[model samples]
Target: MRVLLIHADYFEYEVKDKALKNPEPISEDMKRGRMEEVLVAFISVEKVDEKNPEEVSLKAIEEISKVAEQVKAENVFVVPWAHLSSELAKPSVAMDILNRVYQGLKERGFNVGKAPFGYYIAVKISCKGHPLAELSRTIVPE
Candidate 1:
């Protein structure tokens, strides 16, 4: 799993066309959401993660939580971002990994939201552009 974390002033997105044959369904509200003072996690799940999706997901969320704490952002947004990796996993598996991280963060008490998987989404973000505003982590399950 490849993860990029951004501490942004605001984040917004609109769900677009299906990127896969079977995409995750979304509600009317899910089609659009915007939040201020947030941590946006751009996640891309790769084929290697299939070996132990759970482990990688946990580690990625661990990475996320660390930054969330450092940035003092309560709003954590997880967005499925395929462009981070050339070797992407199947849509279903990718969704599972993303969902696990989303739920895990919520369980850990962060205000988290996840974008629908397997779609071309239009997103706008204003990064804080501070020393710790932008960061990246790559997790390979053991």
Candidate 2:
């Protein structure tokens, strides 16, 4: 199995927050064609404008995406760090980003798998269509 790992943290004067999530993976074959990473180091509003912050984020994300042919990531864990305020970590925003990214990766031609929480997401990719899938399917809490 081919897998990729990433660690992301955003720290700025105005915004102090942190989150952790699994990054997209590139299969052994696809690694040659596509694989990129955009590190969102941090975001600031007082120093940098809000509108521009997103642009910055996109630019960084694009930087990593240039090389990647496939990507699938877990939801950003909002407010994960203690030093930051809850308002800084946007769950909805992170979810939106993940949704767009997952779709974008698929559009670019990746065998993107579905994911729920981190646990399910990891298991789905690890097991894929094997008996694990069946085991996972058997115990849906309805």
Candidate 3:
């Protein structure tokens, strides 16, 4: 199955055990400032799009919802947190994105889920691990 993950240019993501994580920390100024001094990729699932088939599109939110539904996601997560960068420091922007993503999915007949976290700006989405996926006829052809 194909998937679509989209976010603003400043946003970043990391994935482990099929769960999305945004390791970017909160700043004293409440903005996702430039952590140029640090090059740590450990930030929970740091920027996998660099090597993934995922495309950065303009309508990223819309496409993200589409892929979730197409893949029959067991659960769609929309975890929001701030990155501490001055670029994305506003709570309104974070809320805007989260609200848009939620509305977009619902318009397509999906009631995506959200997670409460530190930052108020960025959001994360996840799907339940495929339980019987390994035994599926199409995936295994057995």
Candidate 4:
């Protein structure tokens, strides 16, 4: 799993249109949502990650949490981004892993939000412009 965490003054996203033919309905909240002082996570679920979803997700969230704490983030947003990795998982598998990461972050008690998976989304964010505002990590089972 590839995780990119950005500490931003604000993060915004809009569900622009359907990326897949048979897409999931866009929820009211996902139509347009924004969060301030957040650690926004762009996650790429790779094919290898599907082999050990639990461990990969756990490691990814653990890394993300570390960055979130370092940046003093009050909120966390998990967005599924396929462009980060050349080898991607099947849509179903990728969505499952992304959901696991989102749920894991919530279970760990962070105010968390997730972008709708497998959709065309328009995102905008204002980075904190600090040294630690953006971080990246690749996670795998130990």
Candidate 4: stretches off by over 4 Å: none
Where is the poorest 10-residue window by lDDT in model 3?
133-142
Ranking by lDDT: 1, 4, 3, 2
lDDT of 2 at 16: 16
Best candidate according to TM-score? 1
| Native-structure RMSD, model 2 | 17.4
- Pairs with steric clashes in candidate 1: none
Error of 2 at 50 (Å): 7.3
> Who wins the lDDT comparison?
1
- Once fitted onto the true fold, the runs of candidate 3 whose alpha carbons sit more than 4 angstroms away are 1-58, 83-86, 116-142
TM-scores for every candidate against the unseen true structure: 0.96, 0.31, 0.37, 0.94
- What tens-digit string does per-residue lDDT give for candidate 4 at 1-142? 7878889889988888788887656758668999999999999899888788888888888888888887788699998898789999988888888888899999888999988876788888898878998888988756
Q: Which digits, one per residue and each the tens of the lDDT, describe model 2 over residues 1-142?
A: 0112222222111111212365333344422221122221111112222233354334433433442312232221111111212233243444444444455545544433322212111100121232211110000011
- The TM-score measured for candidate 1 stands at 0.96
Measured over all alpha carbons after superposition, the RMSD of each candidate to the real structure, in angstroms, is: 1.0, 17.4, 14.7, 1.2
Compare candidates 1 and 3 on lDDT and give the better one: 1
Clashes of 4: 0
Instruction: Give the clashing pairs for model 4.
Output: none
Go through the candidates in order and give each one's C-alpha lDDT.
Answer: 0.90, 0.27, 0.33, 0.86
Q: Please report the TM-score between candidate 2 and the true structure.
A: 0.31
